[PDB]
Structures are given as structure tokens and as C-alpha cells.
Design a protein around this motif. Sequence first.
Motif, PDB file in Angstrom:
ATOM      1  N   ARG B  38      26.886  26.873  47.889  1.00 27.80           N
ATOM      2  CA  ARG B  38      27.757  26.084  48.730  1.00 27.80           C
ATOM      3  C   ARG B  38      27.030  24.956  49.489  1.00 27.80           C
ATOM      4  O   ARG B  38      27.515  23.838  49.505  1.00 27.80           O
ATOM      5  N   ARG B  83      33.566  28.632  33.028  1.00 34.18           N
ATOM      6  CA  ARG B  83      33.685  28.993  34.433  1.00 34.18           C
ATOM      7  C   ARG B  83      35.133  29.072  34.860  1.00 34.18           C
ATOM      8  O   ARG B  83      35.995  28.410  34.301  1.00 34.18           O
ATOM      9  N   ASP B  86      39.437  28.231  41.395  1.00 34.07           N
ATOM     10  CA  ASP B  86      40.695  28.277  42.120  1.00 34.07           C
ATOM     11  C   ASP B  86      41.438  26.953  41.935  1.00 34.07           C
ATOM     12  O   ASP B  86      40.839  25.941  41.561  1.00 34.07           O
ATOM     13  N   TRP B  88      42.631  24.670  43.753  1.00 35.48           N
ATOM     14  CA  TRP B  88      42.267  23.480  44.544  1.00 35.48           C
ATOM     15  C   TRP B  88      41.118  22.679  43.953  1.00 35.48           C
ATOM     16  O   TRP B  88      40.811  21.617  44.476  1.00 35.48           O
ATOM     17  N   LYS B  92      43.219  19.535  47.241  1.00 34.30           N
ATOM     18  CA  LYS B  92      43.646  20.418  48.337  1.00 34.30           C
ATOM     19  C   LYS B  92      45.167  20.581  48.491  1.00 34.30           C
ATOM     20  O   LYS B  92      45.610  21.472  49.203  1.00 34.30           O
ATOM     21  N   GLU B  93      45.961  19.760  47.809  1.00 38.86           N
ATOM     22  CA  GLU B  93      47.421  19.974  47.727  1.00 38.86           C
ATOM     23  C   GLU B  93      47.850  21.170  46.871  1.00 38.86           C
ATOM     24  O   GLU B  93      49.005  21.605  46.956  1.00 38.86           O
ATOM     25  N   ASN B  96      46.484  28.838  45.198  1.00 40.57           N
ATOM     26  CA  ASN B  96      46.651  29.809  44.100  1.00 40.57           C
ATOM     27  C   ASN B  96      48.065  30.367  43.869  1.00 40.57           C
ATOM     28  O   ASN B  96      48.290  31.078  42.886  1.00 40.57           O
ATOM     29  N   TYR B 137      34.353  36.571  36.667  1.00 31.74           N
ATOM     30  CA  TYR B 137      35.731  37.024  36.642  1.00 31.74           C
ATOM     31  C   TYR B 137      36.584  35.784  36.369  1.00 31.74           C
ATOM     32  O   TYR B 137      37.683  35.633  36.906  1.00 31.74           O
ATOM     33  N   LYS B 139      38.204  35.016  33.799  1.00 32.36           N
ATOM     34  CA  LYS B 139      39.519  35.414  33.280  1.00 32.36           C
ATOM     35  C   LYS B 139      40.505  35.786  34.410  1.00 32.36           C
ATOM     36  O   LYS B 139      41.712  35.678  34.229  1.00 32.36           O
ATOM     37  N   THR B 140      39.983  36.201  35.556  1.00 30.87           N
ATOM     38  CA  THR B 140      40.803  36.492  36.738  1.00 30.87           C
ATOM     39  C   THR B 140      41.342  35.242  37.433  1.00 30.87           C
ATOM     40  O   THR B 140      42.473  35.257  37.944  1.00 30.87           O
ATOM     41  N   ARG B 141      40.538  34.177  37.466  1.00 32.59           N
ATOM     42  CA  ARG B 141      40.883  32.984  38.243  1.00 32.59           C
ATOM     43  C   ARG B 141      41.997  32.165  37.626  1.00 32.59           C
ATOM     44  O   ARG B 141      42.228  32.232  36.417  1.00 32.59           O
ATOM     45  N   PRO B 142      42.707  31.385  38.453  1.00 28.62           N
ATOM     46  CA  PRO B 142      43.831  30.610  37.916  1.00 28.62           C
ATOM     47  C   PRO B 142      43.488  29.508  36.913  1.00 28.62           C
ATOM     48  O   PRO B 142      44.357  29.129  36.119  1.00 28.62           O
ATOM     49  N   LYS B 195      49.632  37.361  31.660  1.00 23.92           N
ATOM     50  CA  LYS B 195      49.857  36.331  32.674  1.00 23.92           C
ATOM     51  C   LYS B 195      49.376  34.979  32.128  1.00 23.92           C
ATOM     52  O   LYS B 195      48.522  34.935  31.248  1.00 23.92           O
TER      53      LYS B 195
END
Lengths: 176, 205
Positions: B38, B83, B86, B88, B92-93, B96, B137, B139-142, B195
Motif C-alpha cells: 500500500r 489478479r 474490488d 473500485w 470510486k463511484e 462491491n 482469492y 476467484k472470490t473478488r468481483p 455467480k
Amino acid sequence: IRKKLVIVGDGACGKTCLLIVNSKDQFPEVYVPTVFENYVADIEVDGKQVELALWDTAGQEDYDRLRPLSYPDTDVILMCFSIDSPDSLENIPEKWTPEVKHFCPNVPIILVGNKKDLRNDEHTRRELAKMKQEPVKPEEGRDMANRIGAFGYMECSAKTKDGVREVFEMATRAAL
Amino acid sequence: KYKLCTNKEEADAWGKKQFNKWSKEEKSAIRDYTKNARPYNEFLRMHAGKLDSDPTMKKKIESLDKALNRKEAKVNDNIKVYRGDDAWIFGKEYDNSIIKNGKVDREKFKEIQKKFQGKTTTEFGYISTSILIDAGYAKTRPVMTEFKVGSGTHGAYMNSDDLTAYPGQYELLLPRNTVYKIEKIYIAIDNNTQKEQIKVEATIK
Ligand SMILES: Nc1nc2c(ncn2[C@@H]2O[C@H](COP(=O)(O)OP(=O)(O)OP(O)(O)=S)[C@@H](O)[C@H]2O)c(=O)[nH]1
Ligand SMILES: [Mg+2]
């Protein structure tokens, strides 16, 4: 100096928010990550400095197949449930304990009750009572921790920060 | 075409063939990034890649750049890497809830592909990827991105404690200021979870 922690527990039980707040970010309101990215925590306990690598996991059953990739060479497990979800507590012995004991045999476990702020919350009480439930009592968390052979039981609220540093201090003591 | 590692065996095989003899300083730079990306990436995005704003990050950023800009520090093969992100990532508009009950909001989705599909862009931060689709993860993320990485692209493979605080991520780290072209933004159904996910195909240029 270097240790590995993996956090597990039911979907929506507060894992990611707990990691985020421990990283000293504010409690997330709008932008809530599904899984928190790499973050090593610097923690000192009993005169020893620790770099604790925290591994977030997806709690939903749909991602059971992925979770084993996080488990190797773990020093401590944070096994979580939410205090506002007796159902999440029942998944401790039914799902999480067998899983962790299979992939992380004899790795120390901290049992963690999340969302402690909801124990004395009216909406939570009222919603839970509709299904003849109530918030998990501290005694019940403690009993579960004893039943599964955890290092210890801790309660916290990511929302208020109450107990958050203590969770990670205990995990570090268990990792050493 | 591009190599795709489908399992641990293939990823390890490919891993062993990658350059690993960095200097002590170079390894510590790479490993420091993996402890928390970060401060590197947020600083680079916020200051458009200018370093003088903060002397402390300037020094760390130049040390990492040096490790990744090294002659041997590059990919021998054409390779696909992955990769998750999320929502955003697209601004930022978005948040999830763009995925609701495993369905992607079609209106918001169409705004996103209208704005980003076919776009060439320069990333001010570094780009963390995995050679294994399952290994994050992601595959988990949007949002899931596949980067088509052409042979000769600079970077570092990290899957051991000397190079990363998180071994077992089968990581390929790409240099800052990497330019990529978003070829396609589309929706796909995961067969396991049933999903929708937003999928991005990007090519490293
Ligand atoms: N009241 C209260 N709510 C919380 C707390 N921690 C998290 N939440 C809320 O619970 C919800 C889920 O939290 P999150 O941290 O995303 O769960 P998770 O365990 O990471 O869920 P997953 O990624 O396996 S599906 C969020 O809406 C968040 O705001 C807390 O300490 N108190
Ligand atoms: Mg989460």
C-alpha cells in the motif's frame, strides 16, 4: 521474528474488517474488500518483536477448494465467529475445527468472537429472538474454546476497536 | 501463444526456471514490498510516479525498481498471470454491491466497458500477479484480470521466504509504470459458485 497467521470463519463474520482495523485503517463503511491484501503486522509481546504475516480467507463454502492454498506452514489460526450469530458459532465445531485440524494439524488456535458491539444491541436482540436465538454469551465462547482445545478465547469489535489489539497480541503469544 | 500454469506442479516447474540470484539489497526491497504494497502503490498513484515528494518512499521505490530493472529479472516465456480486484479499480463511484446475489449490474457493467474496454493505460504502482488462477482469492473478488505477459517483460517471481513474506502465492511482480492494453471487459459465470464475475483481458505492452 517471522510468523504466519491465517484467519478463518463463516462468511460475513467480520474477518476482513478485523484485519483492516488492526492495520489502523478506519472501520470500512462503503468500500469493503472481500479479502484483505498482504499486510505484515508488527507486534511486540514479552520482550520479543514479531512480524506477523496475516492471511485473510474467504469463509463461504463455495471457496472451500481454494482455502487449502493458504494453510501451509501456519503458526497460529484465528478461528472466528460472530457474537450476533449463534449459527456461526455452531459452525466452529462442525466445519472450521475439522478443516483446520486436517490442514493445520496441531497448529495453535485462538477462538475469536467478533462484533462484540452487537451483544448489547437492540436490533440484534430483536432479530435474533425471531428465530429463538440471542447473542452468544461470553461463557459459551469460552466453553467452545475449551471444547476445541484452543490456546484461548478473545472477543472483539472491529467497529469500536474494543479487544482488537488483544486478539493479535494473544495470537502472537500463541505463534511463539 | 501464452503459457498457462494449471496446477502446483506446473507453477513450480516454471518457477524454478526463473531468475532468483538477486542481491541481498534487491531481495529485501522485493520482500519489503510484499509485507504491505500500500505505501508503495498509493504513493505512486497519488503523486503520478514522482518520488521527491517523500524521500523515504523515494529510496525504497528506487531500490525495488533497481531489482526489477536488472538484466536477468525478466520472463523468458509468454505467460498468462492473474489478479483479483474490488470494483473500485474502475473508479470510486463503484463498490462491491455491483454484484448483487451473484449477478453483475448490467447498467454499471456497460458504463465500465464503455469507459475502459480498449483503453491503453500506464500503472503508476507495481503490479502483483499470480501464475496460478487459484492462488489468491482472485476467484472470490468481483473483478478478475488476466494479464498476457510477453517474453522479455521485466519482473520477479517470488514463492519463498527470502523473496516474500507470503510464500505460496506463486507471485510474479511486474515493474511500476507498466503499460497495458485492456483488450476485453466481459462477464463470466463461475461454474463452481454459479455467480457472475467481471473479467478483464489485458496485454502487457
Ligand atoms: N457491528 C459490527 N459489524 C461488523 C463488525 N465487523 C464487521 N462488521 C460487518 O459485517 C459485515 C461483514 O464483515 P467482513 O469483515 O466483510 O466479513 P468476512 O468475515 O470478511 O466475510 P467473507 O469475506 O468471508 S464473505 C460487514 O457488513 C461489516 O460492516 C463489527 O465489529 N461490528
Ligand atoms: Mg472478507
